[PDB]
């Protein structure tokens, strides 16, 4: 997975575009760029690899508690993980209709 | 921030949607319903709050070296921090060409 560092090179960045120089399969070079904006996000002020929509990457999501979505949920490896989230976190009550904080 | 469960009974999760029975700032109960689809994501097998779109809430981004993306990211309390993310984690070398695997 990734490490095009490894056979490119001259690379910069502009915004969120990256452009490199790098090796081809059979011999020679190619110029290219990628815009990593629907790949990268800021979660509360760090850089991370966005992740996938919970509904397809996910199963058996349900409430546990009182407050907690809870489901099995695949690994980028297509291992399924047993995971939650407390809904209370940023979820809040705006005289009486559900709205995200 | 949030903090429905205090205020809301009966809570129900279908597939990605939540609904809940809620108190009204004025007396009454609400019902509403919410989807999380949008604000939740799977990243690597676990739930989390999704972030924000990073060339709208970022700046200053630069190549660190090889493969190190940087760039000063705004936190949920709106103040700038600096971050750093690796490449090469998650883009490929494919024959000459930047690609996203």
Redesign the interface.
């Known amino acids: 997975?990734?490490?095009?560092?490894?056979?490119?090179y001259n690379?910069?960045?502009?915004?969120?575009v990256?452009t490199?120089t790098?090796?081809?399969?059979n011999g020679?070079?190619?110029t290219?760029?990628?815009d990593?904006?629907s790949?990268?996000?800021?979660?509360?002020?760090?850089?991370?690899?966005?992740?996938?929509?919970?509904?397809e990457?996910?199963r058996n999501?349900?409430?546990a508690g009182?407050?907690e979505?809870?489901?099995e949920?695949?690994?980028?490896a297509q291992?399924?993980?047993s995971?939650?989230?407390n809904?209370?976190?940023?979820?809040?009550?705006i005289?009486?209709?559900?709205?995200?904080?």
């Open positions: 997975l990734g490490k095009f560092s490894q056979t490119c690379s910069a960045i502009q915004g969120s990256l490199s790098c090796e081809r399969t020679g070079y190619n290219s760029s990628i990593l904006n790949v990268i996000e800021n979660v509360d002020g760090s850089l991370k690899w966005q992740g996938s929509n919970f509904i990457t996910c999501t349900q409430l009182s407050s979505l809870a489901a949920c695949k690994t980028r291992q399924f993980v995971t939650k989230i809904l209370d976190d940023h979820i809040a009550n005289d009486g209709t559900l709205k995200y904080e």
